[PDB]
Homo-oligomer: A and B are copies of this chain.
Amino acid sequence: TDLASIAREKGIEFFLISFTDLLGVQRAKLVPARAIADMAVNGAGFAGFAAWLDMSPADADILAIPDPESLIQLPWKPSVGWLAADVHFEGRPFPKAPRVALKSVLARAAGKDMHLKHGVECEFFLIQPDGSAISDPADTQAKPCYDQDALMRRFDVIAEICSYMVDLGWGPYQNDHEDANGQFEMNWDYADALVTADRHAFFKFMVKSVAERHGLRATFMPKPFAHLTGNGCHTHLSMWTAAGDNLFEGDGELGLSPTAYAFLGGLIGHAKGLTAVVNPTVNSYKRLNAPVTVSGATWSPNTITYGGNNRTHMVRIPDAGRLELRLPDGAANPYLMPAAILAAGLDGIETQADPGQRLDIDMYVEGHSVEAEQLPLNLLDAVRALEADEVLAGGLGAAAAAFAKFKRAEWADYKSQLTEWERRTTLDC
């Protein structure tokens, strides 16, 4: 069946033909069902410079061609169908568009019979619409993680969204209040990277939209409050043959194969550049290497290291047959994040990279007793690392340079902003 028939069968009156730009912003046209057939073949036209794609106002329209397999009837508004799209320019997929960049990396891995599957942990906060405070003034205790009371106080919002994921078939399996006051996490089944990436992009839209209907606001900001735990977007990772075998399952340490350790070697080896992509904002660097929070731990990475089932490192091994990359934050691009992770891991496999020694220690407490490379400390340093990393920059194609350009502009803007701390501590010099 084609989209026009489906629209008629399911009662879809409009479609959002949607794409994700380099900064993660969802761009779309809302097209009435009468126009979907033509759009589905030829794509919907956009002026690319108006989005974060690093183009020019003089360029021809890009055409975003929807992937009919990605269709989602908005569970909160079923007369509307959401579609993920590949941006095309000059008759070909446009290499600066995140989804296109990911599919390229995926195609290279697939040609080696290695298929990335991943799940995302999209932690978010529920806050007042004005952004001044969390949504629940009674959520105050020092260790609020897994709080039953505060979770159930937001039951209506959380249950509504979980039930939508049940109906969409994502296989959600748990929800909780997370470690910061105001913060939540809703988990669902991993899938082929592309599937998860589209789900990741839609999920954020869904949470934000539903929150708003409830008179709340959701944020995925990496570090919205200085003294509270931040928003991670941990990525659990495994690589599979087309025949359905998990290449990461093995007889080695912690139930991992040498292929899993080499992939891990790639993450470790390329970590500095990876950070630019998966911690893509100035604020990202206040979540990494952060002072101890009120709850007693940041739970985010400080160092380029890994442990076993241990949440104090860049990588955790949570169970046999997979790796948890704890590095990414809530701002990480749903498509660029897996693309950069795969480029790194693939190079790790191809070069049989050594991940180094597993550290079975609490890095927050004992990191001083061990020599370990620190992660890049600010956005500018991460971006330089990205630019200097041939495997990453090469693997992401033109997206990498465009991304770096934008982040450098953001940095230049940020660095000129006077802060209150400066006024307080310098006025009397």
Which residues does A use to contact B, with CB under 8 Å? Answer: 13-14, 16, 18, 24-32, 34-35, 38-39, 44, 46-47, 49-52, 56-61, 77, 80, 127, 129, 131, 138, 141, 143, 145-149, 151-153, 155, 158-159, 162-163, 166, 171-176, 179, 205, 208-209, 212, 219-226, 281-283, 285-286, 290-291, 295-297, 299, 307-312, 318, 330-331, 360-365, 377, 410, 412-423, 425-429
Contact = CB atoms under 8 A, between A and B. Distances in A.
A197 to B, nearest CB: 16
A129 B310 CA distance: 39
- Which of A56, A131, A299, A428 has the most chain B CB within a 10 Å cutoff? A428
- Which of A39, A226, A361, A418 has the most chain B CB within a 10 Å cutoff? A418
A34 B173 contact: yes
A291 B59 CA distance: 20
A22 to B, nearest CB: 11
Contacts of A307: 58
Given A58-B360, A311-B58, A426-B281, A166 B226 contact: no
B429 A147 contact: no
A18 B311 CA distance: 22
Contact of A422 (B283, B291, B360, B420): B283
B426 A35 contact: no
A336 to B, nearest CB: 13
This protein's copies in its complex: 3
A418 B225 contact: yes
A27 B162 contact: no
Given A18-B148, A50-B143, A414-B422, 18 more contacts: A13-B159, A28-B148, A31-B175, A32-B173, A39-B174, A44-B174, A50-B145, A50-B179, A57-B312, A58-B362, A58-B363, A60-B310, A77-B155, A149-B205, A221-B423, A224-B423, A283-B418, A417-B419
A51 B311 contact: no
Contact of A32 (B166, B176, B318, B420): B166
B418 A30 contact: no
Nearest to A20: B148
B52 A308 contact: no
Given A14-B162, A416-B226, A418-B225, A361 B429 contact: no
B417 A176 contact: no
A363 to B, nearest CB: 8
- The 4 nearest A-B residue pairs measured at CB: A50-B145, A60-B309, A35-B173, A26-B148
A308 B29 contact: no
Given A174-B31, A221-B426, A331-B429, A146 B50 contact: yes
A31 B318 CA distance: 20
Nearest to A208: B149
Nearest to A220: B429
A73 to B, nearest CB: 14
A363 B57 CA distance: 9
A34 to B, nearest CB: 6
Nearest to A330: B429
A417 B419 CA distance: 9
A290 B26 contact: no
A221 B30 contact: no
